[PDB]
Amino acid sequence: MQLVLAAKYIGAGISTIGLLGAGIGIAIVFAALINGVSRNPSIKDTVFPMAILGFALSEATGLFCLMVSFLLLFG
Amino acid sequence: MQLVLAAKYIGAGISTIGLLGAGIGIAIVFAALINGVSRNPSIKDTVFPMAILGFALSEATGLFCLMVSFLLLFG
Amino acid sequence: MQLVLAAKYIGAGISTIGLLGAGIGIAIVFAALINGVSRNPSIKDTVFPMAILGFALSEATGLFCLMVSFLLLF
Amino acid sequence: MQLVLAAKYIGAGISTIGLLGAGIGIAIVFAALINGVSRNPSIKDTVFPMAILGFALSEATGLFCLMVSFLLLF
Amino acid sequence: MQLVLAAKYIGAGISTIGLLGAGIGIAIVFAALINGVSRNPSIKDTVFPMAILGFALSEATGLFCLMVSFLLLF
Amino acid sequence: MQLVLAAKYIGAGISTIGLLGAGIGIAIVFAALINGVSRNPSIKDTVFPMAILGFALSEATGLFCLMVSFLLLF
Amino acid sequence: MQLVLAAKYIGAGISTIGLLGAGIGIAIVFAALINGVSRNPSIKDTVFPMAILGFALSEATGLFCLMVSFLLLF
Amino acid sequence: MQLVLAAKYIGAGISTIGLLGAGIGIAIVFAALINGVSRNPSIKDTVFPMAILGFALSEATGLFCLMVSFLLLF
Amino acid sequence: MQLVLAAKYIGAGISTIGLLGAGIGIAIVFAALINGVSRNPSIKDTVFPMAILGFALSEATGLFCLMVSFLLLFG
Amino acid sequence: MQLVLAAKYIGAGISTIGLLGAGIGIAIVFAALINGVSRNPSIKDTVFPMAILGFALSEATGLFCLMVSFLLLFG
Numbered sequence A, B, I, J: 001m002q003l004v005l006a007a008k009y010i011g012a013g014i015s016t017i018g019l020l021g022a023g024i025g026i027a028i029v030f031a032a033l034i035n036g037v038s039r040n041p042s043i044k045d046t047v048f049p050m051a052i053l054g055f056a057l058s059e060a061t062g063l064f065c066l067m068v069s070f071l072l073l074f075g
Numbered sequence C, D, E, F, G, H: 001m002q003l004v005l006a007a008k009y010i011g012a013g014i015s016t017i018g019l020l021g022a023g024i025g026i027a028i029v030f031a032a033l034i035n036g037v038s039r040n041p042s043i044k045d046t047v048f049p050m051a052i053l054g055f056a057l058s059e060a061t062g063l064f065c066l067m068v069s070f071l072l073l074f
């Protein structure tokens, strides 16, 4: 069992790597929101909900990584 | 049976790394949606369904990673 | 036989890393489609089958990863 | 128990890798804010709250990594 | 020989990683095709064969990875 | 305890990897400052503090990596 | 000798990773050729030889990787 | 003591990976300087000290990697 | 000595990773050559030697990786 | 003495990975030089010395990797 526990711990750590994707992706979405509103202020009310949807969908990939991490850590 | 279990757990953590791809990719699609709508608001109803398609296709690559991850963790 | 079986399962996990390329590449294609249509709506019918071809070819690289992953798993 | 201890230290180091996404992502947000303001100074007040939200959400991904890190260390 | 067979299976999984390069590259080429055609529809017949060549050459890098991978698996 | 000490030293090296994110991020912010000022010199006093904030926030992600690294080394 | 054999198989898989640079690099070259031609069809004959040179030099990096790979396998 | 010493040397190698961030980030800063000057020559004296600040701050992240590498080596 | 030889072989394989940098960098330089000449044909004779210098300098990073690889393989 | 030597050799291969950074970075600088000269040929004598500086600074990060690599291989 020392070997299995050790594996859960290294695996939990590895499972967080993919969070770099959400980190960068979330930022890409908000960068486009900022550049889109700067170029066309009147479009704000239209593109802001799209940025929220995009954030949420990118963020969810990170959710899936963290879920696995916690399953290894505790489950 | 120790060694095999330990391998399943390390392998499961490694399987989540690919999700970073869907995390960046989902964001790339929504950035384009936002930038395209900002430049040409009239195109919104044409490009929004394209963004949905692109996001789902990108997301599915991530699904494949998480599928292998779950096959390892439980299967 | 445990060590070999263990190696199969580590290998199957590693074999999915490459799917990040399709995740990004599929998105790159659709981004080009959206921006190309927004700039020139009249071109939509010409570039749409191009985006479908480009995404399917990109996705295929990731499927070859998954194939090796399943060869290792099963 | 020395093996499990060793594993926690290795895992804690690995758990910091994902913070590179936050370091890059925060910068992407601030780059857009700077370029957006330079192109249209008058939009500053409108886009600044968006940059705060975007950087906060991007940085959160790095906090989750560090949270796993500190769970393993302590 | 549990060591040798284990090495073949882990080696085979590692060998698929580079396929991410084709996944991204193929997409980069098709994105430029799409953006090129949107900007200048009349150039379609000229740039399309160029995109086919580019995709082919980028895809081949992936083929080589898969070849080393299959060598190790069999 | 040769295993535990070995794990601390390998863990510490792995913990510096994420500093690449700050290295790239800091540069992204200063590049936008430079491009922003070149395009609109009059905005310099407005965007400069924004670049300082952005650099600070991106650099902090690196600080955290170095902190885990130093924890493991000592 | 089984350990050294195992190592050659692992090393051969690792040696294919660098081919992702070729897959991306070839695509970058063809993207520029497509966009360059779309913007200025009349330059085609001048830039095409440049794209051949650039892709050949980029692909060479992947051949060196594969060369190391095949040295380890055979 | 061999296993610990071995871990120090593996760790020292791993500790250099992060220097790729400064390699890229320094280049990002100079790229912005060149393009900003080419577009607006008159701004050179304003943006040059910005590029020096930005590069030195980016480089520093890599130096912290090297520091950990030398702590491990010596 | 089995352990040292095995290490030379895995190390030689690892030492090729950095060649992805030359692969991408060379391509970046030639992409700029192509885009620069397309936008301004008259600058060709001026930017072409710069592209060669840039190719050579990027390429040399790859040289250094391969040199280490061959030192491990044979030296 | 086996184990330590083996570690020096694996560590030396790992130390070259960072060179990918200088490989891309050198290329980024020369791409900007080419694009800037193409847009404004008159600026060549001003931006060429900047490219040299940027390339040398980027290259030096790679030098640091190769330095650790050589310290491991021989030192």
Ligand SMILES: CC[C@H]1/C=C/C=C/C[C@@H](C)[C@H](O)[C@H](C)C(=O)[C@@H](C)[C@H](O)[C@@H](C)C(=O)[C@@H](C)[C@H](O)[C@@H](C)/C=C/C(=O)O[C@@H]2[C@H](C)[C@H](CC1)O[C@]1(CC[C@H](C)[C@H](C[C@@H](C)O)O1)[C@H]2C
Pocket (backbone or CB within 6 Å): A052, A055, A056, A057, A059, A060, A062, A063, A064, A066, D053, D056, D057, D060, D061, D064
């Ligand atoms: C399922 C995918 C995501 C769902 C998104 C839904 C978006 C719709 C939208 C209206 C959204 O609710 C808004 C934009 C929002 O995020 C609200 C709730 C936040 O309070 C925003 C505005 C906010 O201010 C942020 C900056 C807040 O201050 C900080 C503390 C939160 C950051 C954060 O990342 O929270 C996440 C995120 C919402 C994250 C988002 C999940 O949820 C949390 C909570 C549950 C787990 C732990 C996940 C793990 C995860 C890996 O994805 O993190 C929580 C913990």
Ligand SMILES: CC[C@H]1/C=C/C=C/C[C@@H](C)[C@H](O)[C@H](C)C(=O)[C@@H](C)[C@H](O)[C@@H](C)C(=O)[C@@H](C)[C@H](O)[C@@H](C)/C=C/C(=O)O[C@@H]2[C@H](C)[C@H](CC1)O[C@]1(CC[C@H](C)[C@H](C[C@@H](C)O)O1)[C@H]2C
Pocket (backbone or CB within 6 Å): A053, A056, A057, A060, A061, A064, B052, B056, B057, B059, B060, B062, B063, B064, B066
């Ligand atoms: C075939 C692959 C994808 C399918 C896409 C289909 C797209 C069509 C389109 C109409 C889409 O269904 C719409 C826009 C949609 O996403 C719906 C379901 C959402 O509820 C939208 C409206 C929404 O509000 C989202 C953004 C919501 O705010 C937050 C909380 C959802 C986050 C999320 O990550 O959802 C995903 C995603 C849809 C993700 C998308 C899967 O599905 C989920 C649910 C099923 C598993 C658990 C997957 C795991 C996966 C790895 O593949 O994650 C779930 C978990």
Ligand SMILES: CC[C@H]1/C=C/C=C/C[C@@H](C)[C@H](O)[C@H](C)C(=O)[C@@H](C)[C@H](O)[C@@H](C)C(=O)[C@@H](C)[C@H](O)[C@@H](C)/C=C/C(=O)O[C@@H]2[C@H](C)[C@H](CC1)O[C@]1(CC[C@H](C)[C@H](C[C@@H](C)O)O1)[C@H]2C
Pocket (backbone or CB within 6 Å): E053, E056, E057, E058, E060, E061, E064, G052, G056, G057, G059, G060, G063, G066
């Ligand atoms: C500097 C090194 C590169 C040489 C480039 C030379 C470029 C000149 C240019 C005129 C080029 O030859 C043209 C574009 C070209 O590739 C011709 C021959 C092809 O017919 C093109 C048009 C073509 O249709 C391709 C897509 C063909 O259909 C498919 C099957 C081949 C793809 C491919 O990537 O091949 C490579 C590549 C040329 C690859 C590129 C190597 O070479 C091949 C063939 C030679 C050996 C066998 C190497 C080693 C090897 C073991 O990886 O692989 C081969 C295998």
Ligand SMILES: CC[C@H]1/C=C/C=C/C[C@@H](C)[C@H](O)[C@H](C)C(=O)[C@@H](C)[C@H](O)[C@@H](C)C(=O)[C@@H](C)[C@H](O)[C@@H](C)/C=C/C(=O)O[C@@H]2[C@H](C)[C@H](CC1)O[C@]1(CC[C@H](C)[C@H](C[C@@H](C)O)O1)[C@H]2C
Pocket (backbone or CB within 6 Å): C053, C056, C057, C060, C061, C064, E052, E055, E056, E057, E059, E060, E062, E063, E066
């Ligand atoms: C380096 C040589 C490449 C050749 C390129 C040739 C280009 C010419 C061009 C006219 C081409 O024939 C056209 C566009 C084409 O691909 C045809 C055959 C396809 O049917 C197109 C139209 C198509 O619809 C695709 C998307 C099809 O729907 C799906 C199922 C195929 C996806 C796919 O990735 O195929 C590859 C690819 C052609 C791939 C291309 C290899 O070949 C396949 C089969 C052989 C091995 C197993 C490779 C593995 C590889 C890692 O490189 O996958 C096959 C399996």
Ligand SMILES: CC[C@H]1/C=C/C=C/C[C@@H](C)[C@H](O)[C@H](C)C(=O)[C@@H](C)[C@H](O)[C@@H](C)C(=O)[C@@H](C)[C@H](O)[C@@H](C)/C=C/C(=O)O[C@@H]2[C@H](C)[C@H](CC1)O[C@]1(CC[C@H](C)[C@H](C[C@@H](C)O)O1)[C@H]2C
Pocket (backbone or CB within 6 Å): D052, D056, D057, D059, D060, D063, D066, F053, F056, F057, F058, F060, F061, F064
């Ligand atoms: C969603 C999660 C993020 C919260 C963001 C909140 C944003 C709102 C916004 C007004 C923000 O608070 C502003 C810009 C801000 O950061 C203020 C407080 C700072 O004073 C800014 C202006 C500042 O000067 C920075 C550069 C300061 O000088 C330096 C020392 C701090 C940098 C830094 O990155 O701090 C982080 C970050 C805010 C980091 C970001 C977390 O929070 C800190 C502080 C709280 C705990 C301790 C966490 C956990 C932690 C263990 O990594 O780290 C801290 C540690």
Ligand SMILES: CC[C@H]1/C=C/C=C/C[C@@H](C)[C@H](O)[C@H](C)C(=O)[C@@H](C)[C@H](O)[C@@H](C)C(=O)[C@@H](C)[C@H](O)[C@@H](C)/C=C/C(=O)O[C@@H]2[C@H](C)[C@H](CC1)O[C@]1(CC[C@H](C)[C@H](C[C@@H](C)O)O1)[C@H]2C
Pocket (backbone or CB within 6 Å): F052, F055, F056, F057, F059, F060, F062, F063, F066, H053, H056, H057, H060, H061, H064
């Ligand atoms: C997250 C908190 C960050 C704080 C940001 C504060 C920004 C405010 C801003 C006005 C700042 O004070 C100015 C621009 C500044 O950096 C001053 C102090 C410098 O002297 C500037 C002008 C300077 O010339 C730099 C390039 C100096 O020449 C060189 C030797 C310093 C490089 C460097 O990277 O310093 C860092 C950084 C400020 C770094 C910044 C941390 O702090 C140092 C010292 C503390 C630890 C060891 C960190 C480790 C880190 C991984 O995060 O490195 C120190 C060592």
Ligand SMILES: CC[C@H]1/C=C/C=C/C[C@@H](C)[C@H](O)[C@H](C)C(=O)[C@@H](C)[C@H](O)[C@@H](C)C(=O)[C@@H](C)[C@H](O)[C@@H](C)/C=C/C(=O)O[C@@H]2[C@H](C)[C@H](CC1)O[C@]1(CC[C@H](C)[C@H](C[C@@H](C)O)O1)[C@H]2C
Pocket (backbone or CB within 6 Å): G053, G056, G057, G060, G061, G064, I052, I055, I056, I057, I059, I060, I062, I063, I064, I066
């Ligand atoms: C020191 C750094 C580089 C020096 C560059 C000098 C550039 C000046 C410029 C005039 C240059 O000589 C020209 C552009 C050039 O490359 C000539 C020689 C080539 O013949 C070009 C035009 C050419 O056609 C290429 C596509 C040729 O067809 C193919 C077969 C060669 C590809 C290649 O990568 O060669 C390299 C490269 C020149 C490479 C370049 C080294 O050298 C080689 C030979 C020595 C070792 C084995 C290195 C290893 C390396 C990792 O860098 O590979 C050789 C093997």
Ligand SMILES: CC[C@H]1/C=C/C=C/C[C@@H](C)[C@H](O)[C@H](C)C(=O)[C@@H](C)[C@H](O)[C@@H](C)C(=O)[C@@H](C)[C@H](O)[C@@H](C)/C=C/C(=O)O[C@@H]2[C@H](C)[C@H](CC1)O[C@]1(CC[C@H](C)[C@H](C[C@@H](C)O)O1)[C@H]2C
Pocket (backbone or CB within 6 Å): I053, I056, I057, I060, I061, I064, J052, J056, J057, J059, J060, J062, J063, J064, J066
């Ligand atoms: C401080 C770090 C850098 C110093 C840069 C100084 C720049 C000032 C500028 C005047 C520069 O010296 C000029 C442009 C220059 O590069 C000279 C020396 C070259 O001979 C130029 C003109 C040239 O023709 C080059 C492109 C030539 O075609 C090819 C064959 C050289 C390739 C090459 O990689 O050189 C490098 C580089 C200059 C590289 C640059 C080091 O140096 C070399 C030689 C010393 C070791 C072996 C390093 C290892 C390193 C990891 O750092 O590689 C050598 C090996």
